[PDB]
């Protein structure tokens, strides 16, 4: 019978079904079926039509995305989507009235709008255009221009610059609505002295002269952007006077040097939490700012400040976690690393510096999902002591020793990886299963925890996969220096433990990474095991996350050392298991993985025959400040220049004579610039090392465009096949 | 015994010996031996020492180049050479006194100087710095700044901009000395509205942010640079008044539209020849400008203008040829294409429009080398009717039917390719042989044409090569449509005509190209034949030069058509000869050849298995105006846009599924921009064609840096070997 071919992955023959819902009330959500936006009731189960598929056939545009106002009165329509960076994009927007049946022609949202968002209650609109903020109380009324200083590539109002979008906020939006819709908090970013990265873009063959793309990009040690935080009142907006934005300044302990705004979370209607981080990211300060109703100013009390610091590494996983405030807003829950280095929920009092841990163990809390007056819902990797697993737990606020796992025993064989979506005030929740079996989407009630109905069970895919020879997934660990280190193997169908298989080491190994988990995936690895009979192994060594600060902080100020060595060591241990042809061991990676892959191939360990590095880092001085400095500090002789110069791929150029090497990079990569790969290629050419190259015209860090995605995975398979000697 | 390996080519194991000399007088030249600059007398044969090797041991710098003043008084010393483009470079210069023994410390020539040149007589210095011209009568005296308008990337005084350096003058210098040293003729280039080409340069690993390189570069149909010509008097230079440069303007027939200054040749002490060319390069006009001694102005007479035009193509081979004036300066000799399309010497009279051809036939004159009152010396491909041959001929000025070949019979088996260097007033000449045998350098006298002595015979190399199994070279023709088309083959040692060999088609095929000649070469082809037993074949199809305008002008307004088809057709004829394994035919090329290689592999002819394209053109709108427009006209719907859009490599993307393709490009290529290759790779990725890629960080159109040159040829050999199994 059939096997999982390359075309099955590239043309996406066997699709995983998802269930994408948005809660609007405490018992109602929305799902679109056959382009018909329906509203599903959780109480009874009866589904009503909210918007029919033929409503926008005469709209004249292909609707890219939609956003419905929380009061169910208006529907924002995104079209003409032009992707910028990872999360950022410019588009055109039209507002449609749901109360009537008319498209609003008056005072329309301008073309090339950067970001648009509704207020949490009602139908107020805040949008960023030309780096400036505009507010609209009614969808047909004129817009109140809040900011005036917005300038392209220089000043950013309501939106993040490149470095804040990618490395800090993980989004384009730098606007924050108050729970009522009274205040619009926003950040301002000044990129005046931030250096530009410049690269060519070639566009269509029609374009005669290549366009140079300039982006404000702070590399390691370079001049960072400055940030200012403002809050404006959306109600008292004069049609004859420019709106007054009250600036909140950072603490004096932060104003000493360079800093970042790394969190904005509203507590109540007049209480806002802010978190600041020093450029050397081992010190963090939280502010709790109240609104002085008489003066109209914002006051953050020094007796309300909370400090987060570490001497073993950086603060947070990638940044300090978000606080979760109780209804009154006098106390917040937050994930902090405890004295033993494990990340658990600490219960804070607004005025008291010391917090009380409500959870503890040799495991970690992933995220706080929902908070009621009775329960706090969180996800953790506690169940069976497996870091690669995710489960929903509930904790009693009146009794911290009463912990109930709501997902652990639902389908123990099929489901070990959970993420959850809660309704307003956490009345009903959707549990989404993602592995090791096929994805399972179920709806549940919080009141008595009964499984009401199965939303999606992927039985349609299950029927298809019975006809195909699928690979098996093994998740186990090995003991090194009295420590458990988890690995995962994609083993070929009919895996014979007595035979010798070729092994490909799938690599990321970044700070706080997890390549070994229980997730069910249909990727390139699936093809290589099912068709080419190759074991695709992944290993979480030192520096990987969800295992405590002892493991995660091991690679602190030492990027390109332990995490690189552990991947080599893992390969030795796999061949010692006896089913690995140690004459055919390969290694591949993307992004950070490409860097480790490159570092490994140049270590001279002789363990690996060949390797593929796709869009790799080659030198930490080439990558952005926020990321690099978080782990490596500053590249100055006074700080950590020694480890910066010692961790380059270029210095390990000679050892590449031992290996077959394929370097791949997109020419329009804004994230990891072609420069990185260009320095590697040059280094190898200098010492007479032969290698393989492949550039991708006008491709970014994802090489994600349909035709390029297919071409790269085709080209890589060909490289792997010839390295392993496969017809 | 041993074979010619890859390392023999890459490490240059077997070196060809050269003999590089510069004439200073009518009977004296200079050669440097063991770093000792000697002066060799042609009259007696006795060599004298001019400058010893230890003279500049305490100089403190590695001497990059030297230039000696004509009067033998001073020696210019180039150091700190920083290459810019093909011919252009910035350097530092010191002047050393030969009369005394002292380095001049007063009024030194500034650092980062673009170009420096002596006057033809004496020791006057003209140098270009920051795009401005400076004159120095004495090496120790202050400098007279002629131009003041010089601005980087905008205004060019005394130096050519990118497009003029590469495509027009074939040099960086835009300065022209008068025979005495009285006048300094110079050109000014305005690049104000010329568009910029922008690419990244990565430099050392230390450089944190890549530098963007901006170059004024006019692509096909884009805004061209404007040109202004000036002449200044070098004698009447006031130390208190800015020098007056007299502007010479172009004819009214040229000022109607865009034009180029394409030639500057001095006739006498007060007579200068200029040649102008329309943007549509099928019309040319020459001016003869005299100096009005009373007014101080320059006057070019309307009754002295000579017109060159063609309706079958472009004027000249790459540009209109240079005139060769007689001693009095009332008549000049020039190579013109005759009525049958063959390029021969036409004798012009300053006032008379019609010229008289002194040579004719089914062959072409290559270049006029020297002119005396008795003889004109020229090189032509006449001997035995071989276009790939070069021979020195002399013609009697009193009798045009009296032609003598001075080189034809010297060593007929060893020597068929000659270039010549003449002394002042052509009293003695050096003949340099370059093939098919080993290079032979001989000194001769013009008076009675006896071979005085052998300068270099490469017998040292001959001894080495007897121990090595060398490939043989065959130069023959094939007849297509009643026309001879010459090809050349690098055949493996002990070539068995009954066996089947793999064939690599070495391609250029550009307008006025010649890949088939008698030259002896030790290249990559030598390795592939000697070690890998591969026939490396080259074929001169339509559009190739030195065979008449019928052949050369065939690809007019049709680039990427006939010349591409003829390379495919040539491969058929080679396999028809029966010693070619038609299952293993490859094709490779550089520059224009890379474009043809790419076009061929995308023709779907199925003749070729694999191919390598190194720094190729992909679309003619991407390459510069002067070159592209010379052959293709303007890329406008009114002109020739149809042929522009039809000749792209991108449109032939689908057919690449049939072939293995290796695309190579240097990232810092100013000539053929990485854009060209980037558009190919994208096009193939779009239609799902798998290929092979290889970029080269901070490499130009030559990929000539030591480590990169070795790496590319290693990488290409590996690709060829696996394609041929
Ligand atoms: N830009 C970084 C981003 C790191 N990941 C990251 O910010 N997130 C992934 C998961 N995550 C995030 C915040 C909190 C988490 C979680 F807690 F781990 F889940 C966002 C990744 C990256 C690393 C390189 F080394 C590189 F070269 C490029 C590159 F994009
Ligand atoms: N720019 C061209 C230059 C071609 N050669 C050239 O102009 N000369 C060499 C021979 N020559 C010249 C004038 C007269 C002659 C001669 F008569 F052929 F000898 C100048 C080379 C080139 C062509 C391409 F198609 C391309 F893409 C890049 C490139 F550099």
């Amino acid at each position: 019978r059939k096997t999982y071919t390359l075309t099955d992955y590239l043309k996406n023959t066997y699709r995983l079904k998802l269930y994408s819902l948005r809660w609007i009330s405490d018992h109602e959500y929305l799902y679109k079926q056959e382009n018909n936006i329906l509203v599903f009731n959780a109480e009874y189960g009866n589904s009503s039509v909210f918007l029919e598929n033929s409503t926008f056939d005469e709209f004249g545009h292909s609707i890219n995305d939609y956003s419905i106002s929380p009061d169910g009165q208006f529907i924002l329509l995104e079209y003409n989507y032009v992707k910028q960076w990872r999360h950022s994009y410019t588009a055109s927007y039209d507002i449609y009235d749901l109360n009537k049946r008319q498209l609003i022609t008056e005072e329309r949202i301008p073309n090339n709008t950067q970001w648009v968002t509704w207020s949490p209650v009602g139908h107020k609109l805040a949008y960023v255009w030309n780096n400036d903020i505009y507010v609209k109380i009614e969808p047909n009324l004129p817009s109140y221009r809040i900011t005036w200083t917005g300038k392209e590539d220089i000043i950013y109002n309501g939106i993040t610059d490149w470095v804040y979008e990618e490395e800090v906020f993980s989004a384009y939006s730098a606007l924050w609505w108050s729970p009522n819709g009274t205040f619009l908090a926003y950040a301002q970013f000044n990129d005046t002295e931030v250096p530009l990265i410049e690269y060519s873009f070639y566009s269509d063959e029609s374009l005669q002269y290549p366009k140079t793309v300039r982006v404000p990009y702070p590399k390691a040690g370079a001049v960072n952007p400055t940030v200012k935080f403002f809050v404006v009142n959306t109600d008292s907006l004069s049609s004859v006077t420019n709106a007054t934005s009250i600036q909140i300044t950072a603490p004096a302990s932060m104003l000493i040097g360079d800093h970042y705004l790394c969190d904005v979370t509203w507590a109540t209607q007049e209480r806002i939490s802010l978190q600041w981080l020093r450029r050397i990211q081992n010190y963090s300060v939280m502010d709790i700012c109240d609104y002085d109703e008489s003066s109209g100013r914002w006051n953050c009390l020094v007796a309300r400040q909370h400090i987060e610091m570490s001497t073993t590494g950086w603060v947070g996983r990638f940044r300090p976690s978000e606080p979760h405030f109780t209804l009154d807003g006098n106390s917040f829950y937050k994930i902090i690393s405890n004295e033993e280095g494990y990340r658990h929920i600490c219960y804070f009092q607004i005025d008291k510096k010391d917090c009380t841990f409500i959870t503890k163990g040799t495991w970690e809390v992933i995220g706080i999902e929902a908070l009621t007056s009775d329960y706090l819902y969180y996800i953790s990797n506690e169940y069976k002591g497996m870091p690669g697993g995710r489960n929903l737990y509930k904790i009693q606020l009146s009794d911290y020793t009463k912990v109930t796992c709501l997902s652990c025993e639902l389908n123990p064989e099929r489901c070990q990886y959970y993420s959850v979506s809660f309704s307003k005030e956490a009345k009903y929740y959707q549990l989404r299963c993602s592995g090791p079996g096929l994805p399972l989407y179920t709806l549940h009630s919080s009141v008595n925890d009964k499984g009401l109905r199965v939303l999606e069970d992927n039985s349609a895919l299950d029927k298809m996969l019975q006809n195909v020879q699928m690979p098996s997934k093994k998740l186990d660990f090995i003991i090194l220096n009295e420590t458990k280190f988890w690995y995962q193997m994609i083993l070929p169908p009919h895996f014979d433990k007595s035979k010798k298989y070729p092994l490909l080491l799938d690599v990321y190994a970044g700070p706080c990474s997890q390549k070994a988990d229980t997730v069910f995936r249909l990727n390139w690895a699936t093809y290589l095991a099912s068709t080419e009979n190759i074991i695709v192994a992944s290993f979480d060594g030192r520096g990987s996350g969800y295992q405590g600060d002892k493991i995660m902080h091991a690679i602190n100020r030492r990027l390109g050392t332990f995490e690189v060595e552990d991947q080599i060591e893992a390969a030795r241990q796999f061949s010692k298991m006896g089913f690995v042809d140690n004459k055919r061991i390969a290694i591949w990676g993307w992004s950070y993985g490409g860097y480790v892959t490159s570092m490994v191939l140049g270590s001279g360990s002789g363990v690996f025959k060949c390797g593929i590095a796709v869009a790799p880092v080659s030198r930490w001085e080439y990558y952005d400040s926020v990321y690099t400095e978080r782990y490596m500090g500053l590249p100055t002789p006074e700080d950590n220049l020694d480890h910066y110069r010692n961790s380059t791929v270029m210095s390990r150029a000679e050892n590449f004579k031992q290996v077959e090497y394929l370097l791949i990079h997109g020419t329009a990569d804004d994230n990891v610039h072609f420069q990185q790969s260009a320095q590697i290629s040059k280094a190898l050419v200098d010492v007479g090392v032969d290698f393989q190259a492949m550039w991708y015209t006008d491709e970014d860090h994802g090489i994600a465009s349909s035709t390029a995605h297919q071409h790269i995975y085709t080209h890589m398979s060909h490289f792997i096949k010839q390295c392993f000697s496969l017809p």
Side-chain angles (χ1 to χ4, degrees), chain A residues 187-204:
Chain A
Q188 184 182 57
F189 304 100
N190 193 357
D191 277 39
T192 302
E193 280 170 292
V194 172
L196 300 172
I197 184 77
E198 314 195 350
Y199 57 85
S200 304
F201 202 93
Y202 306 94
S203 197
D204 300 355

PDB file of all heavy atoms in Angstrom, chain A residues 187-204:
ATOM      1  N   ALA A 187       2.282  53.274  23.389  1.00  0.00           N
ATOM      2  CA  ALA A 187       3.715  53.503  23.497  1.00  0.00           C
ATOM      3  C   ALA A 187       4.234  54.258  22.278  1.00  0.00           C
ATOM      4  O   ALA A 187       3.687  54.141  21.177  1.00  0.00           O
ATOM      5  CB  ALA A 187       4.451  52.184  23.667  1.00  0.00           C
ATOM      6  N   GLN A 188       5.284  55.044  22.492  1.00  0.00           N
ATOM      7  CA  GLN A 188       5.942  55.772  21.417  1.00  0.00           C
ATOM      8  C   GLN A 188       7.382  55.297  21.291  1.00  0.00           C
ATOM      9  O   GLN A 188       8.089  55.181  22.291  1.00  0.00           O
ATOM     10  CB  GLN A 188       5.898  57.280  21.677  1.00  0.00           C
ATOM     11  CG  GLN A 188       6.471  58.117  20.544  1.00  0.00           C
ATOM     12  CD  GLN A 188       6.459  59.603  20.837  1.00  0.00           C
ATOM     13  OE1 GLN A 188       7.021  60.059  21.836  1.00  0.00           O
ATOM     14  NE2 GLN A 188       5.832  60.370  19.955  1.00  0.00           N
ATOM     15  N   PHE A 189       7.809  55.024  20.061  1.00  0.00           N
ATOM     16  CA  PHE A 189       9.155  54.515  19.814  1.00  0.00           C
ATOM     17  C   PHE A 189       9.953  55.471  18.937  1.00  0.00           C
ATOM     18  O   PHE A 189       9.524  55.828  17.838  1.00  0.00           O
ATOM     19  CB  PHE A 189       9.102  53.111  19.192  1.00  0.00           C
ATOM     20  CG  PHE A 189       8.333  52.110  20.012  1.00  0.00           C
ATOM     21  CD1 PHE A 189       7.021  51.786  19.687  1.00  0.00           C
ATOM     22  CD2 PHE A 189       8.919  51.489  21.110  1.00  0.00           C
ATOM     23  CE1 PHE A 189       6.305  50.868  20.441  1.00  0.00           C
ATOM     24  CE2 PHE A 189       8.208  50.570  21.867  1.00  0.00           C
ATOM     25  CZ  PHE A 189       6.900  50.257  21.532  1.00  0.00           C
ATOM     26  N   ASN A 190      11.112  55.886  19.443  1.00  0.00           N
ATOM     27  CA  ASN A 190      11.997  56.801  18.729  1.00  0.00           C
ATOM     28  C   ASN A 190      13.192  56.043  18.148  1.00  0.00           C
ATOM     29  O   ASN A 190      14.017  55.502  18.889  1.00  0.00           O
ATOM     30  CB  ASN A 190      12.452  57.938  19.659  1.00  0.00           C
ATOM     31  CG  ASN A 190      13.103  59.098  18.915  1.00  0.00           C
ATOM     32  OD1 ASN A 190      13.279  59.056  17.698  1.00  0.00           O
ATOM     33  ND2 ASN A 190      13.465  60.144  19.653  1.00  0.00           N
ATOM     34  N   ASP A 191      13.265  56.002  16.819  1.00  0.00           N
ATOM     35  CA  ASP A 191      14.306  55.262  16.103  1.00  0.00           C
ATOM     36  C   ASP A 191      15.317  56.172  15.407  1.00  0.00           C
ATOM     37  O   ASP A 191      16.048  55.723  14.521  1.00  0.00           O
ATOM     38  CB  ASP A 191      13.673  54.315  15.074  1.00  0.00           C
ATOM     39  CG  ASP A 191      13.209  53.002  15.681  1.00  0.00           C
ATOM     40  OD1 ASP A 191      12.683  53.003  16.814  1.00  0.00           O
ATOM     41  OD2 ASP A 191      13.359  51.959  15.012  1.00  0.00           O
ATOM     42  N   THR A 192      15.363  57.439  15.816  1.00  0.00           N
ATOM     43  CA  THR A 192      16.206  58.452  15.164  1.00  0.00           C
ATOM     44  C   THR A 192      17.662  58.006  15.008  1.00  0.00           C
ATOM     45  O   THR A 192      18.231  58.116  13.922  1.00  0.00           O
ATOM     46  CB  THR A 192      16.140  59.818  15.889  1.00  0.00           C
ATOM     47  OG1 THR A 192      14.782  60.272  15.938  1.00  0.00           O
ATOM     48  CG2 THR A 192      16.978  60.869  15.164  1.00  0.00           C
ATOM     49  N   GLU A 193      18.253  57.496  16.085  1.00  0.00           N
ATOM     50  CA  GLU A 193      19.668  57.131  16.074  1.00  0.00           C
ATOM     51  C   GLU A 193      19.930  55.633  15.886  1.00  0.00           C
ATOM     52  O   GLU A 193      21.077  55.179  15.961  1.00  0.00           O
ATOM     53  CB  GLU A 193      20.365  57.663  17.328  1.00  0.00           C
ATOM     54  CG  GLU A 193      20.728  59.137  17.237  1.00  0.00           C
ATOM     55  CD  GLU A 193      21.193  59.704  18.562  1.00  0.00           C
ATOM     56  OE1 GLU A 193      20.363  59.800  19.492  1.00  0.00           O
ATOM     57  OE2 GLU A 193      22.390  60.044  18.675  1.00  0.00           O
ATOM     58  N   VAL A 194      18.861  54.877  15.634  1.00  0.00           N
ATOM     59  CA  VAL A 194      18.963  53.451  15.327  1.00  0.00           C
ATOM     60  C   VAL A 194      19.501  53.282  13.903  1.00  0.00           C
ATOM     61  O   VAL A 194      18.957  53.873  12.966  1.00  0.00           O
ATOM     62  CB  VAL A 194      17.600  52.734  15.486  1.00  0.00           C
ATOM     63  CG1 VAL A 194      17.669  51.301  14.979  1.00  0.00           C
ATOM     64  CG2 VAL A 194      17.152  52.751  16.940  1.00  0.00           C
ATOM     65  N   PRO A 195      20.584  52.490  13.741  1.00  0.00           N
ATOM     66  CA  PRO A 195      21.191  52.267  12.423  1.00  0.00           C
ATOM     67  C   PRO A 195      20.283  51.475  11.479  1.00  0.00           C
ATOM     68  O   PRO A 195      19.440  50.696  11.932  1.00  0.00           O
ATOM     69  CB  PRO A 195      22.456  51.460  12.746  1.00  0.00           C
ATOM     70  CG  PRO A 195      22.696  51.658  14.205  1.00  0.00           C
ATOM     71  CD  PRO A 195      21.333  51.801  14.806  1.00  0.00           C
ATOM     72  N   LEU A 196      20.461  51.681  10.177  1.00  0.00           N
ATOM     73  CA  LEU A 196      19.649  50.995   9.178  1.00  0.00           C
ATOM     74  C   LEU A 196      20.349  49.760   8.622  1.00  0.00           C
ATOM     75  O   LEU A 196      21.557  49.776   8.366  1.00  0.00           O
ATOM     76  CB  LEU A 196      19.290  51.934   8.021  1.00  0.00           C
ATOM     77  CG  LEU A 196      18.503  53.226   8.264  1.00  0.00           C
ATOM     78  CD1 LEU A 196      18.467  54.047   6.985  1.00  0.00           C
ATOM     79  CD2 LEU A 196      17.091  52.957   8.762  1.00  0.00           C
ATOM     80  N   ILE A 197      19.583  48.686   8.453  1.00  0.00           N
ATOM     81  CA  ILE A 197      20.026  47.548   7.658  1.00  0.00           C
ATOM     82  C   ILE A 197      19.497  47.738   6.236  1.00  0.00           C
ATOM     83  O   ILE A 197      18.320  48.054   6.039  1.00  0.00           O
ATOM     84  CB  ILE A 197      19.595  46.187   8.264  1.00  0.00           C
ATOM     85  CG1 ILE A 197      20.174  45.019   7.454  1.00  0.00           C
ATOM     86  CG2 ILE A 197      18.078  46.072   8.383  1.00  0.00           C
ATOM     87  CD1 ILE A 197      21.643  44.750   7.703  1.00  0.00           C
ATOM     88  N   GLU A 198      20.376  47.576   5.253  1.00  0.00           N
ATOM     89  CA  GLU A 198      20.016  47.825   3.860  1.00  0.00           C
ATOM     90  C   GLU A 198      20.258  46.594   2.991  1.00  0.00           C
ATOM     91  O   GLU A 198      21.363  46.045   2.962  1.00  0.00           O
ATOM     92  CB  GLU A 198      20.774  49.035   3.297  1.00  0.00           C
ATOM     93  CG  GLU A 198      20.789  50.259   4.205  1.00  0.00           C
ATOM     94  CD  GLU A 198      21.226  51.535   3.505  1.00  0.00           C
ATOM     95  OE1 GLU A 198      21.701  51.471   2.350  1.00  0.00           O
ATOM     96  OE2 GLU A 198      21.090  52.616   4.118  1.00  0.00           O
ATOM     97  N   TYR A 199      19.212  46.166   2.292  1.00  0.00           N
ATOM     98  CA  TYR A 199      19.314  45.049   1.363  1.00  0.00           C
ATOM     99  C   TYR A 199      18.475  45.274   0.107  1.00  0.00           C
ATOM    100  O   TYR A 199      17.517  46.046   0.122  1.00  0.00           O
ATOM    101  CB  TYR A 199      18.943  43.732   2.050  1.00  0.00           C
ATOM    102  CG  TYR A 199      17.565  43.688   2.681  1.00  0.00           C
ATOM    103  CD1 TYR A 199      16.438  43.362   1.922  1.00  0.00           C
ATOM    104  CD2 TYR A 199      17.391  43.934   4.044  1.00  0.00           C
ATOM    105  CE1 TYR A 199      15.178  43.304   2.499  1.00  0.00           C
ATOM    106  CE2 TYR A 199      16.135  43.877   4.629  1.00  0.00           C
ATOM    107  CZ  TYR A 199      15.033  43.562   3.852  1.00  0.00           C
ATOM    108  OH  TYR A 199      13.781  43.504   4.420  1.00  0.00           O
ATOM    109  N   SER A 200      18.846  44.595  -0.975  1.00  0.00           N
ATOM    110  CA  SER A 200      18.134  44.706  -2.242  1.00  0.00           C
ATOM    111  C   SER A 200      16.854  43.872  -2.277  1.00  0.00           C
ATOM    112  O   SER A 200      16.780  42.781  -1.698  1.00  0.00           O
ATOM    113  CB  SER A 200      19.041  44.300  -3.403  1.00  0.00           C
ATOM    114  OG  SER A 200      20.231  45.065  -3.414  1.00  0.00           O
ATOM    115  N   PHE A 201      15.846  44.414  -2.953  1.00  0.00           N
ATOM    116  CA  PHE A 201      14.644  43.683  -3.313  1.00  0.00           C
ATOM    117  C   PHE A 201      14.486  43.804  -4.827  1.00  0.00           C
ATOM    118  O   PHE A 201      14.644  44.889  -5.385  1.00  0.00           O
ATOM    119  CB  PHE A 201      13.428  44.253  -2.592  1.00  0.00           C
ATOM    120  CG  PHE A 201      12.283  43.288  -2.484  1.00  0.00           C
ATOM    121  CD1 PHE A 201      12.141  42.480  -1.360  1.00  0.00           C
ATOM    122  CD2 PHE A 201      11.345  43.180  -3.509  1.00  0.00           C
ATOM    123  CE1 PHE A 201      11.087  41.584  -1.258  1.00  0.00           C
ATOM    124  CE2 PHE A 201      10.287  42.285  -3.412  1.00  0.00           C
ATOM    125  CZ  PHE A 201      10.158  41.487  -2.284  1.00  0.00           C
ATOM    126  N   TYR A 202      14.180  42.693  -5.489  1.00  0.00           N
ATOM    127  CA  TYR A 202      14.237  42.637  -6.952  1.00  0.00           C
ATOM    128  C   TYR A 202      12.873  42.706  -7.636  1.00  0.00           C
ATOM    129  O   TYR A 202      12.787  43.050  -8.817  1.00  0.00           O
ATOM    130  CB  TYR A 202      15.030  41.404  -7.405  1.00  0.00           C
ATOM    131  CG  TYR A 202      16.411  41.323  -6.786  1.00  0.00           C
ATOM    132  CD1 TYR A 202      16.633  40.583  -5.623  1.00  0.00           C
ATOM    133  CD2 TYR A 202      17.493  41.996  -7.355  1.00  0.00           C
ATOM    134  CE1 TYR A 202      17.892  40.513  -5.047  1.00  0.00           C
ATOM    135  CE2 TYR A 202      18.756  41.933  -6.784  1.00  0.00           C
ATOM    136  CZ  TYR A 202      18.949  41.189  -5.632  1.00  0.00           C
ATOM    137  OH  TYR A 202      20.201  41.121  -5.063  1.00  0.00           O
ATOM    138  N   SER A 203      11.819  42.375  -6.889  1.00  0.00           N
ATOM    139  CA  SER A 203      10.433  42.396  -7.382  1.00  0.00           C
ATOM    140  C   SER A 203      10.244  41.598  -8.684  1.00  0.00           C
ATOM    141  O   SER A 203      10.981  40.646  -8.939  1.00  0.00           O
ATOM    142  CB  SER A 203       9.935  43.839  -7.531  1.00  0.00           C
ATOM    143  OG  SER A 203       8.523  43.888  -7.627  1.00  0.00           O
ATOM    144  N   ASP A 204       9.254  41.983  -9.489  1.00  0.00           N
ATOM    145  CA  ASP A 204       9.004  41.346 -10.784  1.00  0.00           C
ATOM    146  C   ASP A 204      10.165  41.599 -11.734  1.00  0.00           C
ATOM    147  O   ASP A 204      10.939  42.539 -11.536  1.00  0.00           O
ATOM    148  CB  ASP A 204       7.710  41.877 -11.415  1.00  0.00           C
ATOM    149  CG  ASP A 204       6.480  41.623 -10.555  1.00  0.00           C
ATOM    150  OD1 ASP A 204       6.592  40.946  -9.510  1.00  0.00           O
ATOM    151  OD2 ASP A 204       5.391  42.106 -10.932  1.00  0.00           O
TER     152      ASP A 204
END
